[PDB]
């Protein structure tokens, strides 16, 4: 529990991690821009720190999609947590 | 919601701790909540307690002339159950 996951904001987690699980269940590889758009985080919050914190925390990894276009892939830990956060969303 | 503005670590420590006391029928003082949860006294007393109250996740009550406690609301209770499962992923 030094997990940097603990340092993340609940809203950012409950937004981004379920969004990426739902794209994955559909077979779709979304761009950083589509991830922001579907999740509802601000692009300024995303590109000015959040993305790199999710990477640091072992929750996602960034990959090249095509020229000039990157995606995030869930790690097994990020996917395990994403599923737990889906139920949190129901409650809320 | 104010719930979304909370830090995941503080949530994952406090609300599960309270739920586990409640299942055992135990009514902890504020100091016992701090110690069992692993948050510091300063973190708890300098904003976190009151953030959890403002998010509707807990209610503060005077338990006796001696001590206070926090009770889970039903929202707080449902979210605690989900955060336990989250804790099985981390550990
Ligand atoms: Cl964050
Ligand atoms: Cl907090
Ligand atoms: Cl309690």
Please tell me if residue B74 touches chain A, with a CB cutoff of 8 Å. Answer: no
B25 by DSSP, 3-state: which?
coil
Deposited resolution, Å? 2.2
Q: How far is the CA of A34 from the centre of ligand 1 (A)?
A: 19
Within 10 angstroms of residue A42's Cβ, the number of other Cβ atoms is 11
Task: Return the structure tokens found at A88.
Answer: 């949190």
Contact A80 B89 (CB under 8 A): yes
Cα–Cα distance measured from residue A18 to residue A82, given in angstroms and rounded to the nearest whole number: 5
Residue pair A73/A23 in contact (Cβ under 8 Å)? The answer is no
CATH for A2-92, options being 1.20.1050.10, 3.90.650.10, 3.40.50.920, 1.10.10.10: 1.10.10.10
Cα–Cα distance measured from residue A87 to residue A84, given in angstroms and rounded to the nearest whole number: 6
CB contacts < 8 A, A to B, total 60
CATH 1.10.10.10 fits B1-91, yes or no: yes
B41 by DSSP, 3-state: which?
helix
Task: Please report the DSSP string for A34-91 in residue order.
Answer: HHHHHHT--HHHIIIIIHHHHHHTTSEEEEEEETTEEEEEE-HHHHHHHHHHHHHHHH
Helices A76-91 and B74-89: crossing angle in degrees, nearest 10, is: 170
Instruction: Mention every residue, 6+ apart, whose C-beta is less than 8 A from residue B2.
Output: B51, B54, B55, B56
Structure method: X-ray
Cα–Cα distance measured from residue B85 to residue B5, given in angstroms and rounded to the nearest whole number: 21
């Amino acid at each position: 529990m030094d997990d940097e996951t603990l340092r993340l904001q609940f809203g950012h987690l409950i937004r981004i991690l379920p969004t990426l699980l739902e794209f994955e269940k559909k077979g779709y590889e979304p761009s950083l821009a589509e991830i922001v758009k579907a999740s509802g985080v601000s692009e300024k919050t995303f590109f000015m720190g959040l993305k790199d914190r999710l990477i640091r925390a072992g929750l996602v990894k960034e990959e090249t999609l095509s020229y000039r276009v990157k995606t995030l892939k869930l790690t097994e830990k990020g996917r395990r947590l994403a599923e737990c956060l889906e139920k949190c969303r129901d409650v809320l």
